[PDB]
Write an enzyme that holds these catalytic residues in place. Structure first.
Site, PDB file in Angstrom:
ATOM      1  CG  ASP A  19      32.582  42.556  34.231  1.00 55.65           C
ATOM      2  OD1 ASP A  19      32.504  43.297  35.232  1.00 55.65           O
ATOM      3  OD2 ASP A  19      33.509  41.737  34.066  1.00 55.65           O
ATOM      4  CG  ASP A  71      31.201  44.633  38.155  1.00 57.73           C
ATOM      5  OD1 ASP A  71      31.678  43.506  38.391  1.00 57.73           O
ATOM      6  OD2 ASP A  71      31.630  45.396  37.261  1.00 57.73           O
TER       7      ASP A  71
HETATM    8 CA   LIG Z   1      33.782  43.864  37.321  1.00 55.18          CA
END
Ligand SMILES: [Ca+2]
Ligand SMILES: O=c1[nH]cnc2c([C@@H]3N[C@H](CO)[C@@H](O)[C@H]3O)c[nH]c12
Ligand SMILES: O=c1[nH]cnc2c([C@@H]3N[C@H](CO)[C@@H](O)[C@H]3O)c[nH]c12
Ligand SMILES: [Ca+2]
Ligand SMILES: [Ca+2]
Ligand SMILES: [Ca+2]
Lengths: 301, 304, 300, 303
Positions: free
Chosen positions: C8, C13
């Site tokens: 996401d 990330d």
């Molecule tokens: Ca994440």
């Protein structure tokens, strides 16, 4: 000393409020609540928890605004606990009781206090949203306040990362810094917090038992001690320590005119400038007295 | 329709208040004041001058804040005059009488009205100062307001005070951003400087701001005179167009767009209202019924 | 090692993805996107941004579901700025260009890859929605995947608050934990991240400049460091660190059987029980190798 | 009317499918299959039987998911028989012939039908696992569906498999909640378990489930024989009532209360529909035109 407290009562706010409650020279005339990092509903509850853990309960609590003036609150992963107060158990303290909350908005109640209480001081432990609005509604009232004690800002020491209070509502900090006289303003800055940082595992005054206040101190600070190797940058307790003990608490300070950067890459940071009519920005504290003050508030009364 | 009016009563503000005064289906429950065109003290007397000339002084007037939220103030006496109302003479109108000013601060007055007046609407003719402060203190209160009618912004990006910014939203952009991200834009109808220029009039082909014969005609003629000259004979009836839309509803609009508006809060385009299509944003009026507009402006000036 | 990444893509990330791009032993065969830190559309842009700054855009990018299974929104919507990546400026990074999206749904693509790629591993940095659906449509395909590396859960004394991935979709997490074999699962928990965090006032590896990648890391993490007292809690990067470097990354772990509390006041929490057929829950990491890996990917 | 059917084809499903097959203004464009009354593998076999008995096998059949989203397959005291269709003998019906089954998963075929077929309606006769998953993957697609007709739940609190909660929504409560909270409840009609026990005939006062003369009457008689024997000879035609409403519009409905439904996804009482008044909620049919119901039940068995 008469004192109004504005807080987003997280963990270090509560210890700061306790420092003021523990000194008999201090009369807290009211506590205003502002949201932001911790939700306003949570702040009001945590102020109640702190006052109930202490003896005296005759301090009115006022709820202020729910968000910064214009900047987004920027969602917060509260690793220390969802309630903004270490996720302590009310059943372990006898504070599973109804919360007290006055009907007046914190902005108006602050204005009335400023209009009707001589020699009123204010200790600000949170984003200045409530204060900036009260200065907008009634600058004539808030200007009667005798002195401002503020936790906020990061001046050059390098300027450390992570200043919160003013970055969270830079417009409100600018409203305060451009309207209330900086000469009557004393700053306990994030640079000062970082400068007087210590490891709680080298001491014991955040890990005592024997009374309710001692358990409160130990349980609220427990997650901060755990998740950061024991390192503590005392911000709000230092601001209360300075407001309460004055020059006794200050070893060195610098007069600095302060401003908020409201534009560009440095948005939410501050400009500092040597100026004898500027803020009293405290540089060094009596740390030996500070930890002594931290222990004494937990003594049997 | 119960209506609250927030004004920095300059020349076009006062004509907008007369439009609301002239329609009997409009209840003006209170008038909040703010600096902008002129200073707050001048605004308070300008509203008083407006109510006295019309002849229904039974409307409470409240003094708002003394400055924008963060920005320094921006008085334009070279547009609305040194007093904000074309530097008119109070002896020409019989308004050399004491001004009415209620004790309660406008922000607390407006929050109270939203809490105790049902189906309250607001017409905002001035910098977003009093309204933003009230949305910050009591969002649960101000969100009780049925609809928002706001003069401000320019979805073209063509301003007046700056190349990019309309005056009211440039005078207090943070306040404009506070309203646009806190009050539901879907319940918000915008009469921008874009609309004011598009539906502008040449004062030497139209004379409806140039009549005598009664007090209202003299007030409208004398107040609009300096600003008509300043504009080159052109009339951009910004505030009157916003009151026109609020009072006369659907039959005042000819074309409108649904646009999400957001403020430019820094740089040379400070105060610019960015627009982007969105069926839940503000109803941004593009075309008004200019014919019905001139009609109702003449009818409030008629001797009858 | 062939690796699929479910993300996401918020700020941590993007750094986790860069740890995988920086290691030549790793072949990223596909990146699936799900809402969470940002909207699904913002996640697709942020993955495009991360791949373009690195320069290895030859990777398919699939968009997944647009919400958790049953829960309404997200417990923590809009967490990493308005855009999900710290509100960076594309003109500073040269990423204002057409973004690539594949046109098959991220579920169907993960099913296809697991059916056609030998020894495929998967790294999950986001709420368990894309995975749970694919496990619900073709468990025969997903069980072929060699190993699961998941950032999520908070086990334990003290348990840090604020876990997002499994709290955001507890049903999806329970679907994965009871359908894919836990013995083939390795967990980088929110507990591990919190206890393996750094402060920008003590470490500078997220405050560098001198090339594009150093600017991307600094600007993305900047609002996190600024609004969290300087605290760097590198959850997804620790997950990628464990997936890519394996035994070198792990100093201690425990075999624990994990399940989700799907009802009551403790909705969204994780029940852990010692069990040699449960997930490998990493307890300590080689922090020194980790900080060097973060710096290594930022070299000139 | 273009219609898609999702079934766990037990006995009352088959009659409901026959209800749709019997009306010439209905176009069944595809039948999706999910576990429920019996295994998915038996459901695919049982739809094949039903189409073969009627005589029109030009309808594509899709196998769906093998289990509920979160819940276990849970105890199915096989009331619809061992095979799911009353344990009938294929040699008695000429259905000892190969089965038809599409390559595509039911979720993907449903998504594709929603995107490429104008004015498609869906009739749900089973646990809603397939529909929730298609709603999970492509809300864009399943919201192009004009109307949802769903047999499930019980707004009276009186279920069947549990004293609270009907079988289809108890078998997959999370999926039932997904459909309710994502597909607009205003575009949704509900044949509840309230409705199945309300319009419940005793089988020994009618003969519309005990005829012969053709193959369709034998299928109906032999498939309902077990289910009739379980109850006090009663007939609670859950599925067929849902198909009756979907096909025969307003004349199928007598009295109907608009109620907003939601699922209890927790606790000892698991899998029930919380009913509250909502003008923008589901159209819960409370009374059906029973006379017209029996007549179309007889007419589909005509020669
Ligand atoms: Ca994440
Ligand atoms: O040319 C102009 N420049 C700046 N402000 C105004 C106004 C005032 N500012 C607003 C229009 O931008 C309107 O409320 C009006 O009272 C009218 N004309 C001008
Ligand atoms: O006694 C029953 N118990 C459980 N399920 C059913 C059904 C099946 N479940 C649904 C009604 O609960 C319906 O679609 C039908 O196919 C009929 N009768 C019973
Ligand atoms: Ca604080
Ligand atoms: Ca005006
Ligand atoms: Ca059924």
């Amino acid at each position: 000393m008469k004192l109004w407290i504005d807080t987003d009562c997280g963990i270090d706010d509560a210890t700061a409020i306790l420092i003021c409650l523990a000194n008999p020279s201090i009369e807290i005339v009211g506590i205003s609540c502002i949201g932001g990092n911790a939700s306003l509903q949570n702040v009001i509850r945590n102020v109640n928890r702190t006052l109930k853990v202490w003896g005296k309960t005759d301090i009115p609590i006022f709820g202020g605004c729910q968000a910064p003036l214009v900047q987004p609150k920027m969602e917060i992963p509260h690793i220390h606990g969802g309630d903004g107060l270490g996720d302590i158990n009310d059943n372990d303290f006898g504070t599973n009781t109804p919360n007290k909350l006055e009907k007046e908005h914190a902005v108006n109640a602050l204005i009335h206090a400023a209009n009707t209480i001589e020699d009123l001081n204010i200790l600000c432990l949170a984003p200045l949203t409530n204060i900036a609005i009260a200065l907008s509604m009634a600058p004539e009232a808030i200007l009667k306040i005798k002195h401002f004690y503020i936790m906020g800002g990061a001046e050059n020491g390098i300027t450390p990362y992570g200043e919160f209070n003013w970055r969270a509502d830079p417009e409100a900090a600018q409203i305060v810094l451009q309207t209330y006289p900086q000469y009557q303003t004393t700053i306990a800055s994030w640079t000062l917090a970082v400068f007087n940082s210590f490891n709680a595992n080298d001491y014991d005054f955040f890990n005592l038992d024997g009374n309710l206040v001692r358990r409160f101190i130990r349980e609220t600070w427990k997650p901060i001690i755990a998740f950061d190797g024991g390192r503590i940058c005392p911000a709000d307790p230092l601001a209360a320590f300075i407001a309460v003990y004055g020059d006794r608490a200050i070893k060195r300070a610098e007069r600095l005119h302060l401003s908020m950067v409201l534009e560009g890459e440095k948005l939410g940071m501050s400009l500092a400038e040597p100026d004898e009519k500027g803020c009293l920005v405290v540089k060094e504290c009596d740390a030996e007295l500070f930890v002594k003050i931290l222990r004494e508030l937990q003594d049997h009364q």
